């Protein structure tokens, strides 16, 4: 089922300069892979669904 990547991301970038560009972006990445890791770090591994989610350049396209 769909997870609250918005309500969750709301924390990831709860105080991020781009509280929007971040969340928003997550609002999409979520669709790509319903994964929301804690804070920000290697934790990604935990949720590769979104981790593996990168661009062509090979950089984290998602926040």
From Swiss-Prot:
Question: Tissue expression, per UniProt?
Answer: Expressed in pollen (at protein level).
Q: Which Pfam families match?
A: GASA (PF02704)
Q: Which positions form S-S bridges?
A: none
Which UniProt keyword terms apply here? Allergen
Q: Which domain of life is it from?
A: Eukaryota
Checking InterPro entries in the record gives: GASA (IPR003854)
The Swiss-Prot or TrEMBL record describes its family as follows: Belongs to the GASA family.
PANTHER family for the chain: EXTENSIN, PROLINE-RICH PROTEIN (PTHR23201)
Q: What is this protein called?
A: Cypmaclein
Tell me which species this is from: Cryptomeria japonica (Japanese cedar)
